[PDB]
Ligand binder design. Structure first.
Ligand code: NI
Ligand code: NI
Ligand code: NI
Ligand code: NI
Ligand code: NI
Ligand code: NI
Lengths: 569, 238, 569, 342, 238
């Protein structure tokens, strides 16, 4: 029973229990909480390695023989930041533990058995995390998909029909016809998709068809008329059809104020976008909504993290979203009374306190579809700087905080739109949407994006070279991104109603197709870690944001992690 | 003699009894079954002869077997013996309670719980409230029932009780005799705090704003303690 | 946050952590290791109880709404002896934990949500355990089924075709024709069934058809000719078809001795019956086989536990099994040189040491089909008496020992015949074959036997009475035991081959039908708790049984628990 | 003709099969027993010896519904199942009916609140199905005033209206006097004998999980078995105040004593009150026809199945039972189901 | 009293017995059933009281009915009475052998076989062979078992036994105590003489040439008496 030194061990199998990893260049320190291996029996593939016939690979596999093994993987998920082997079978997470060959290994469950049929993927040294799920996508251009994908985003929930104004302003694919188109278009892409409908309508009839037509929910956007009527109608139908509903509060306050909007929501579940304010909504309050139970708070994107140039930026954007032509009087008045450095500031803090739960993007509409994950982390690193560790933190690490910022674009959005059963976290049973992160580039530049248990895109080099490592090394589409293969590795979400009515056959969808569920039964308390409720106020004058009594405001930054250190642009 | 399956059931039981009696007779400590039967079988005949009453047999059965008659454990086992027999007035349920006693030290499946106390509803800041039954009939409210919506007779501050349940053992309840006045203990409802049903007062999320409505409706519906309508501003949904 | 006294609490919800329960009248003490409830939120059904509209029962259930809840159940399974709510949905264990109504309860997963559709079954105070699985059934008469069922046995694996001699001697349903009959007959019963084939044949062809014909495995019986040839042939085909194989060693030693038999098994997986010896086999050694890795040791039944009258009993039996007519010379010589009080004794000890792993019955062929579970426990209680607690035991209880004797007729036999995936233990995902045990009558007289998530038979009283409690109180068939219902609640196991060839349709089976798997990849080490290997010997003279060196022999008993205290006969 | 079999009936009394409609499907053994009584149709809810069933006649959810309907196949006795009216979730309330349920049941143990009560009622309307109820005893939500107010005048079949069977203490029985109500009597509290009251004290325990010990429990269980309400019952049954005679099989009622008691209770009343004003000629025909339709035509109507069964009238299903005068009301000669001896 | 179908079985039997005893009491010769029951029923009680042992009851049952008690024929009929009862140590099988006797001349289904002897295996030239058990364990060989392939312990001339079976009554066998030495009788196997199985030595047609192989394999496999490999010429199939 010889013994080796961690020094070695780690370079061999990766950080084990008690060890700590630095997320990218941020001051966020992760610590391996647990490890499922059996020191001396760990899986290694290569020349004369372990994963070989009769050895680590059973010649008498279990009738569950894995399709693919990700050896020695450091798992950072809302369920823990531990170590272990991740197994994949039939496009799903078949098992998470030891695994190898029961014929020669002490603790290998038929769940994680390695056989002639299972491929080997090294993971030691890397950090495996579930794919992100940006849920505030404005389907303006099909080019976002790929970009977002390169981020660490496997699922995109939004509304829209291309570079059309209605779409440029709101994430809504209006009507069942336009719905058909996108669902049919979706077939093309490598990235789970779900579309939202126009909640903006006080016509129950017209409101139900879109859901029966594939929509996983509704969206109430200011540009379409976010009135209490619309708001109420949408909400009710949403209940009947067990589907989610997003909202972009009535800024101009024409119909009323948040008081009214909240009164309309009648306590029903509601996923709020750019809650903070800059993204749009009831000026100035709104952000105060993120403190209520029935609300699913979400942060936009640009106003995160808080840097010296943030405020100086937004002034424009409004124009290129609400058709706020840079000239008109009425326009050039509110657009200015919305980008409050106040609300913008507290945000970060609110995100730290668990006041906010999701981190959208708003792709091409006041948000970077490729900067969700990155920012979520910066914003974390930042907060740590200014506030230090957290009270809930245990041990010399930031695990708890990590697991908070992480589930902000993984498990929390998945729940927000009833798809937490299939995706959103590295847990056995769910769809194998995983991404391997090389510690140094965590939160910004992922190694590979495996979709539905099979590589869809990864960092690839000189296709002509003698090895995959040599430059140019950018992201290149992978097999599960082509042919019929794509069809097998992706899921286009829709509603039960549609699912049952056979929307799949109806529209000849070849893509996998599942229905969204459990969307009306959830509340703020259903948000992992970020489940904090707390009556907040906002001074109409100073605009200062108060919570429970105390005042919350982060300090603007002059530099951020995960930036210029990694991209030539 | 049209024999009902019910009758056969008994004819069988009866002899199950005869064996029983016939065994101890020969001097043998009766076991679980044997006791049970015997006891039961007795009542059946007693009801037949039409002499003793239900009330009586219910008691007299406790005098059929001495703690030295049965085996060690039997006593503890037979918590009670239920048996319906046909009395001249009709079939009746003679329930014989604890017919024998712990004349032994053995007790099958006995419980060795570890002394100490369990704290119900951990950290849940309770609150007392005056509650008087101004109605002619009694009222038992339960553990997880939205107190605020209790019978429109329990006069008290509904307002102070919005979204709360009698801080007591999960399951049990509190009784109010017409007239009786007390101060119940009631913690906030946990979970997502989604009140739906009961008296139709909330049917939403326990909100300080949803509250306004509940308080308003209870006023119109007549629940004592439901404050008053100080120029109520109606909402777009309620 | 008031506080109550255990005294109360328990009588209200049942033994909680730290509390200990006495199994029946035995000196076996169980201790609640863990509890998933939330003191103050526990589930209770009744008059003004908790399980009621909008309260503990959600008016907004999850799209997983449970079919049935077994509230406050003390779970005694090889996976732990803890406390919690057991949920059932679609004839399966949907969840094991808290559960109730997320609208009013702190920790209820949609896994265990209670809704208008979920029935309520009280369990507080009772001990819930998976159904037993007798695997040495001689299908002599259909009347055993019901009896075994009343025991706490939900699954019966054996061979046979009724009161015919071949069956009276061996558990084998010979040929595919006879196979048809039984499978077709099985339809009738309320008790999962699986049949074994005649391993006794050196005709590969003839050996493969029976499996393709529904058999979940083979059986090599002495009366049919357990020769190394047969033994080898059977074994190989068994490998090819991933099915289990049982054996009844060559007693007369005509072909050879265990040396030879073991040599034949060639290390392959083999489930041995009445390993001890009295049940039959290579005199006197055999029992020594239970110490080898590749072997799946199993104990018969009568020779357990060891009482003063055991030996005095067997002398006969042999006659009524091997057609050993009480007269012939050659017969009246070995029948006497097989019932060794020696091997019989060590057995119990071997069972305690984990030397033995399964406790069969041999229904109507030297074994009581209704006394498997009972004896398994007596034998435990006994051993504790004479040897006291166990070294592996922790805390003031016999949990470990319990979990050992328990998995002897649950998880270990299930694995023995590749059906551990569906049944054999109270774990989420498996078939809901459960039985509620009233502590006082544990190990002998169960309250009710629920098959496939629905009551099939339970203690019932005077059907005419005003309540179900009043005598006569014996076992009465329940709804899931009748109509088409039975079909939905039972599983007749067969092989993949057959499963794939469509044996179900082939034979018009209406019963659920699953295939057995992972039978060749298992070994002694695959036996829960009872996974101990150890070179054992047996003196040809004294017949004394030795293990690792030391000698093992239990002392005969003059009285046993779980007996005359409970049955009028 | 050559094709018609002959069955003698001269000397016997032929009557339609009884229809017990308050069956708690606790154990399949009741069926046969009830059958031996003169009961061809059993309407109730439940899923076997499970607590929910032991307390209420409700087969919850469409899944459990499947099971029982599938199980029913086994038996010789028309069957119909009730659903959990106890839910303020319209959606969840409609599926059970679409799933085979002939109606709903609102039981105290599940939470008979005005909300549930209202919801159940409305859906029941939409789907033209019957609804039973077991009034809110503890009066927690309110009193009969409220419950009746909830029923909003809609049709409602009330169980153990009298009280002992369960419900709004003490009033409830008063409900049997309203138009929109379908009054029904339990079983044990009928007829009224010296031992009745002495009996019930227990039962409550073995139905509402009223563990014989707890304080709150050992208070109402006593304030429910009123020798008062129990008494008037019989009379109410004579006056036509009550209309149906259930059983509550294995839950405070003898599944094999519905018909018998219904008759005793009649014989009794005659004793103490003599014939009836509506009676004509030297006989008790009218009274007979009253007590009879209490377990035949009246329950059949109560659950919309009077077209097929419930009375010896041309066109309906041939569920008949021949009674040998001497054993009338207790021991029938034969039970023919669907025109053929069963 | 959760009554197991097993228990009812007995409760029924018991009274089957009571009737029995109650009949002879009134002075009536017991018949097959009546005897059987009675005998059985007795043991059941005896086991109950927990006094007598299995070994004993097994014997004492033979003292329950005198040859003058039962009817003529009964005695011969009851070859034996098997009955399991629950002893304090657990259920046990009390097998009561021939409880009564031929005090009568009648014997139902009696056999009138015609004296004389049957010749086993007609015209089948037998052969004797020395056979000693050089092993520590006993060995019983059967009627139709290829002797040549018997346990690798019975030392003898396998060669002389190729394709033959112990010339004895079809079914029976021969026993060899460790050490014991005898000369068995063994005729050739009839039929097509197709040996397949056993110890895998032949698995073909009993040929003088197939023999070579068997003899060779047994040599390598270690069966005593399996001559030796005098430069064995291998064949193309074996
Ligand atoms: Ni927006
Ligand atoms: Ni937007
Ligand atoms: Ni055997
Ligand atoms: Ni056997
Ligand atoms: Ni009731
Ligand atoms: Ni009832």
């Amino acid at each position: 029973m010889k013994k080796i030194s961690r020094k070695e061990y780690v370079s061999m199998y990766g950080p084990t229990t008690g060890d700590k990893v630095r997320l990218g260049d941020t001051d966020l320190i992760a610590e391996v909480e647990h490890d499922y291996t059996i020191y001396g029996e760990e899986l290694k593939f290569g020349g004369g390695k372990t994963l070989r016939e009769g050895m680590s690979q059973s010649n008498n596999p279990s009738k569950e023989e894995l399709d693919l093994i990700i050896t020695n993987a450091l798992i950072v998920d809302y369920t823990g930041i531990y170590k272990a082997d991740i197994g994949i079978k039939d496009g799903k997470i078949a098992g998470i533990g030891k695994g190898g060959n029961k014929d020669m290994q002490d603790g290998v469950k038929n769940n994680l058995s390695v056989g002639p049929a299972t491929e080997a993927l090294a993971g030691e040294g890397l950090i495996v995390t579930a794919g992100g799920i940006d849920t505030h996508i404005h389907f303006i251009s099909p080019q976002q998909i790929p970009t977002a994908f390169a981020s660490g985003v496997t699922t995109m929930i939004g509304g829209g029909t291309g570079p059309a104004d209605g779409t440029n302003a709101t994430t809504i694919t209006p009507g069942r016809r336009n719905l058909k188109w996108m669902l049919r278009a979706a077939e093309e892409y490598s990235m789970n998709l779900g579309f939202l409908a126009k909640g903006n309508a006080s016509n129950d009839a017209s409101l139900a068809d879109q859901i029966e037509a594939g929509a996983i929910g509704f969206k109430i956007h200011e540009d379409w008329g976010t009135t209490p009527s619309a708001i109420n109608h949408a909400l009710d139908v949403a209940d009947k059809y067990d589907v989610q509903v997003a909202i972009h509060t009535d800024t101009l306050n024409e119909a009323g104020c948040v008081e009214d909007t909240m009164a309309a929501i009648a306590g029903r579940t509601m996923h709020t976008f750019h809650t903070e304010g800059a993204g749009g909504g009831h000026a100035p309050d709104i952000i105060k909504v993120a403190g209520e139970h029935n609300i699913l708070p979400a942060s936009t994107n640009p106003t995160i993290p808080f840097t010296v140039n943030t405020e100086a930026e937004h002034m424009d954007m409004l124009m290129v979203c609400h058709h706020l032509d840079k000239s008109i009087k009425e326009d050039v008045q509110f657009a200015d009374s919305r980008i409050r450095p106040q609300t913008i500031a507290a945000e970060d803090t609110l995100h730290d306190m668990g006041a906010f739960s999701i981190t959208s993007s708003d792709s091409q509409a006041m948000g970077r579809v490729g900067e969700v994950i990155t920012r979520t982390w910066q914003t974390a690193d930042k907060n740590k700087k200014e506030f230090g560790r957290l009270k809930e933190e245990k041990g010399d690490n930031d695990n708890f905080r990590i697991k908070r910022y992480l589930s902000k674009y993984t498990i929390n959005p998945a729940i927000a739109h009833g798809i937490s059963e299939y995706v959103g976290s590295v847990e056995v049973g769910k769809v194998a949407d995983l991404v391997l992160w090389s510690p140094a580039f965590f939160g910004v530049k992922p190694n590979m994006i495996i979709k539905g248990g099979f590589i869809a895109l990864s960092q690839m080099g000189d296709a002509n070279a003698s090895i995959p490592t040599p430059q140019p090394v950018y992201y290149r589409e992978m097999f599960a991104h082509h042919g019929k293969a794509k069809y097998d590795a992706n899921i286009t979400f829709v509603s039960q109603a549609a699912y049952d009515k056979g929307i799949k056959e109806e529209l000849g969808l070849e893509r996998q197709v599942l229905p969204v569920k459990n969307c009306r039964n959830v509340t703020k308390k259903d948000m992992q870690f970020n489940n904090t409720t707390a009556h907040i106020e906002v001074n109409p004058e100073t605009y200062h944001v108060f919570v429970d009594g105390k005042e919350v405001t982060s300090k603007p930054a002059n530099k951020v992690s995960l930036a210029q250190l990694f991209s030539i642009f | 003699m049209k024999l009902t399956p019910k009758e056969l059931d008994k004819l069988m039981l009866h002899y199950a009894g005869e064996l029983a009696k016939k065994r101890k007779e020969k001097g043998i400590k009766l076991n679980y079954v044997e006791a049970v039967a015997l006891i039961s079988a007795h009542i059946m005949e007693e009801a037949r002869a039409g002499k003793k009453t239900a009330a009586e047999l219910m008691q007299e059965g406790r005098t059929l077997l001495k703690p030295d008659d049965v085996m060690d454990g039997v006593a503890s086992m037979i918590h009670e013996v239920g048996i319906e027999a046909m009395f001249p007035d009709g079939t009746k349920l003679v329930t014989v309670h604890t017919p024998i006693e712990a004349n032994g030290k053995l007790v099958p499946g006995e419980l060795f719980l570890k002394n100490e106390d369990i704290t119900i509803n951990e950290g849940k800041k309770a609150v007392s409230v005056k509650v008087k039954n101004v109605g002619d009939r009694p009222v038992q409210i339960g553990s997880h029932f939205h107190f605020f919506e209790v019978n429109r007779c329990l006069d008290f501050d509904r307002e102070k009780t919005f979204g709360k349940r009698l801080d007591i053992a999960a399951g049990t309840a509190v009784r109010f005799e017409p007239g009786e006045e007390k101060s119940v203990e009631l913690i906030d409802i946990g979970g997502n705090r989604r009140i739906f049903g009961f008296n139709a007062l909330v049917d939403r999320q326990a909100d300080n704003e949803s509250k306004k409505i509940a308080l308003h409706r209870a006023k119109e519906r007549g629940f004592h303690g439901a404050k008053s309508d100080d120029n109520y501003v109606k909402t777009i949904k309620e």
